[PDB]
Design a protein around this nucleic acid. Structure first.
Lengths: 82, 59, 226, 142, 182
RNA sequence: AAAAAUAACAAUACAGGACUCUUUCGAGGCCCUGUAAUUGGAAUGAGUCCACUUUAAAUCCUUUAACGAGGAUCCAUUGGAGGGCAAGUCUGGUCGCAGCAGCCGCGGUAAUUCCAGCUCCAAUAGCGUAUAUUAAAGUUGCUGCAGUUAAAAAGCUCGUA
RNA sequence: CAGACACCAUGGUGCACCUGACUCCUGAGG
């Protein structure tokens, strides 16, 4: 949370989400991301360089999360048989 | 209830008598006394002795 | 005479990283939103300028099979004056024991409270950026930001919490039951924490998310088990 | 909640609030003038009367004591009232037809302590202050 | 005609920690009582409210401009506030101490003939100084900038020079009646 | 309603802390705060008072020759100290008696609530008390109330204002 | 489930109680 032209107030900058556009606050439970490994393709065999999605308390308790992850993953690629 | 009869009055005061200590010193006037409380409490003897203790406590 | 001691026992990845100093502050942990189940982590990063205030020492009871039984319920609040605070309740057989456990519980629960401004933007935060409300049992405390030099205008029990919170200027109104003190402190505790939970337009700007310290330090944290 | 809030409903709010105001006990007693009519304070603050008689009152439980009151008829109000006599062994200085200045207690319009029918306390005996007699600043002139 | 109080009474009569705070201010700045502290509390609260009002007025508005400048100028004249800061935001940050420090008593300590925040007050009240060629008998006063350049002994205390009263002469006759034996 | 006096400063005798010396103990050391013993100069009007002033004429103020502080004094009070409530795990006395007590409650013999004394606290030339009204009180709820069960939806529908 | 199933009233009281600082200090040596 900035003050003025871009002075830093603040204790830290929290994680956000894009499955419901709501911040992960402050020490909350059921808040974790999900590193899917990339594969380099064509020759196979995992190469880095994680794709990370941020999952909040809210989505998980409302049993959304399964579908959400696929929408997020597909939209930016890449998984075989899409 | 309603009743009508007074009985005993000033029973305790009929056997307690007052006495006096007089003065070594006057009980202090205005500004001087107000200043004196702050000095006696804090600037003396800068507090380092004891804890959890009243100004008239026997605890 | 008497003297303290300290010992570290990890049962989890987080404890090992803290002592090894791959984590240097609680802020990292809070950001990742991972639990803290070891008091030593808070002690190691701070362990100084932590004031413990016992809010009440009040007893409660239950009736046992033969005559009465009674026990002491203690409320302890902890916090630095830099924007971190905790609250812990413990009930034990004696007064001393109840407070001793309560302190440990208070440290564990330590949570960041966001600090902001009334309208200012220069000279560093003196209040909160948003009005935050918390409810406990039909008591509602509403914190409203106040400008500089106003001071904390609150009842003694919420005022102490606000002081630790780093809110030096605040208007409050509390409505509901005023006889109950454990509820009053709890409701104020709910309110202060809620500042991070508010999304401001200064906080909109988005981030690419953690890759988790568990995954990244995985190799490091083989010691005899990952 | 439960109220009207249109664009012309000023009149309805204004009168509804007025109508409901009267329910409250604290409001009603004062506004109907009941307080003046029943109790001698409300429309006065202090009142002087002549002592009718000295009463001993074998105080209603809880608390076992003889409370000891005086009965006073107030000159201004014209009402007979039993008033507590405070201070230790201070009953004594009251005499029948010797006046007293009476004032309210502290509940206001309602009985105090463990004793019903008393809601007033004496302040001066012989118009020269019971307090001053008790301390011994001043003497009883009568 | 019309009259007004210069002090304020807070809503809680016993509040131990605050009472201690107020006693400490009295000690530091040599005051008579809590009423002296309340006197500053009343003034300071009004200054902050003045500031706060101005600050919520629209900018480039005659009323905000004219009264803003006036409030600032007054606070700089008495040397509470400095004009290298000089806006509403900074006025809010002022506290009770900042006023007390610019009083006549605390200047009479800082230079001149007092030895303490005790002594100073008694010296002023006993007319040992002029501020200029003008006696001042009031220790709670608040001097302006260029009035701290003229605090000096009086000609009506006869040490530091001045016409013999009856206190210098009293000391003379402890040598001519105490030691003169008559 | 306004100003804010009824003493301020050293000395010494002590209780103390930065500084120095000493292994430490201890001692020196400046700033003093109190508490003795009294003081030493040094000050000021409260009173007292020629003179000048005030004013219709006066008074008082603001002006001043000559006077006015070493102390239990030139000598401040009014309530509180069980809880709310700041300050007695007081000492004597009483013992559910006298009283205390807005309210909650004390007192029936080892009374931290009484009655005195002592000490301490709070405000301080003011403070206590009674009472009206206001705030707190979102316990009248426009902003901003509650109505399943805590006080509270008309038996139900039509229906005009 | 799918055997039998009756009168019976009354009665009083108090003290449950609230704070943290590890020595038997070793005492030939130390």
């Amino acid at each position: 949370m900035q003050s003025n032209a871009g002075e830093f107030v603040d204790l830290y900058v929290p994680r956000k989400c894009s499955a419901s556009n709501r911040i992960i606050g402050a020490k909350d439970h059921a808040s974790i991301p999900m590193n899917v490994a990339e594969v380099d393709k064509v020759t196979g065999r995992f190469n880095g360089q994680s794709k990370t999605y941020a999952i909040c308390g809210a989505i998980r308790r409302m049993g959304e999360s399964d579908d959400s992850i696929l929408r997020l993953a597909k939209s930016h690629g890449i998984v075989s048989q899409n | 209830k309603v009743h009508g009869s007074l009985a005993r009055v000033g029973k305790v005061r009929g056997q307690t008598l007052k006495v006096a200590k007089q003065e070594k010193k006057k009980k202090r006037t205005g500004r001087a006394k107000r200043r004196m409380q702050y000095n006696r409490r804090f600037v003396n003897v800068v507090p380092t002795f004891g804890k959890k203790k009243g100004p008239n406590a026997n605890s | 005479g008497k003297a303290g001691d300290k010992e570290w026992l990890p049962v989890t990845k987080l404890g090992r990283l803290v002592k090894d100093m791959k984590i240097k502050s609680l802020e990292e942990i809070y950001l990742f939103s991972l639990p803290i189940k070891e008091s030593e982590i808070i002690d190691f990063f701070l362990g100084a300028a932590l004031k413990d205030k016992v809010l009440k020492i009040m007893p409660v009871q239950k009736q046992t099979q033969a005559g009465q039984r009674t026990r002491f319920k203690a409320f302890v609040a902890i916090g630095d004056y830099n924007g971190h605070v905790g609250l812990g309740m413990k009930c034990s057989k004696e007064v001393a024991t109840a407070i001793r456990g309560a302190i440990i519980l208070a440290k564990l629960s330590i949570v960041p409270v966001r600090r902001g401004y009334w309208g200012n933007k220069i000279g560093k935060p003196h209040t909160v950026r948003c009005k935050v409300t918390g409810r406990c049992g039909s008591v509602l405390v509403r914190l409203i930001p106040a400008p500089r030099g106003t001071g904390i205008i609150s009842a003694p029990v919420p005022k102490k919490l606000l002081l630790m919170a780093g809110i030096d200027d605040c208007y409050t109104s509390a409505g509901g039951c005023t006889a109950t003190l454990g509820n009053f402190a709890k409701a104020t505790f709910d309110a202060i924490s809620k500042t991070y939970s508010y999304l401001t337009p200064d906080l909109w700007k988005e981030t690419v998310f953690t890759k988790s310290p568990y995954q990244e330090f995985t190799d490091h944290l083989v010691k005899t088990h990952t | 909640m439960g109220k009207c809030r249109g664009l012309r409903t000023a009149r309805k709010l204004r009168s509804h609030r007025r109508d409901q105001k009267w329910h409250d006990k604290q409001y009603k007693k004062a506004h109907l003038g009941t307080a003046l009519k029943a109790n001698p304070f409300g429309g006065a603050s202090h009142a002087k009367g002549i002592v009718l008689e000295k009463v001993g009152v074998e105080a209603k439980q809880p608390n076992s004591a003889i409370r000891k009151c005086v009965r006073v008829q107030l000159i201004k109000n014209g009402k007979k009232i039993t008033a507590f006599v405070p201070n230790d062994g201070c009953l004594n200085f009251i005499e029948e037809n010797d006046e007293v200045l009476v004032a309210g207690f502290g509940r206001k319009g309602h009985a105090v302590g463990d004793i019903p029918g008393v809601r007033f306390k004496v302040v001066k005996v012989a118009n020269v202050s019971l307090l001053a007699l008790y301390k011994g600043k001043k003497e009883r002139p009568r | 005609w019309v009259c007004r109080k210069t002090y304020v009474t807070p809503r809680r009569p016993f509040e131990k920690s605050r009472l201690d705070q107020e006693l400490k201010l009295i000690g530091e700045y040599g005051l008579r009582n809590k009423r002296e502290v309340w006197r500053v509390k009343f003034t300071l609260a009004k200054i902050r409210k003045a500031a706060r009002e101005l600050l919520t007025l629209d900018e480039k508005d005659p009323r905000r401009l004219f009264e803003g400048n006036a409030l600032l100028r007054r606070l700089v004249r008495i040397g509470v506030l400095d004009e290298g800061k000089m806006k509403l935001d900074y006025i809010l940050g002022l506290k009770i101490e900042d006023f007390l420090e610019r009083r006549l008593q605390t200047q009479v300590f800082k230079l001149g003939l007092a030895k303490s925040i005790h002594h100073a007050r008694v010296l002023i009240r006993q007319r040992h100084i002029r501020v200029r060629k003008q006696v001042v008998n009031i220790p709670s006063f608040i001097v302006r900038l260029d009035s701290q350049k003229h605090i000096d002994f009086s000609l009506r205390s006869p040490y530091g020079g001045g016409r013999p009263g009856r206190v210098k002469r009293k000391n003379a006759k402890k040598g001519q009646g105490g030691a003169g034996a008559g």
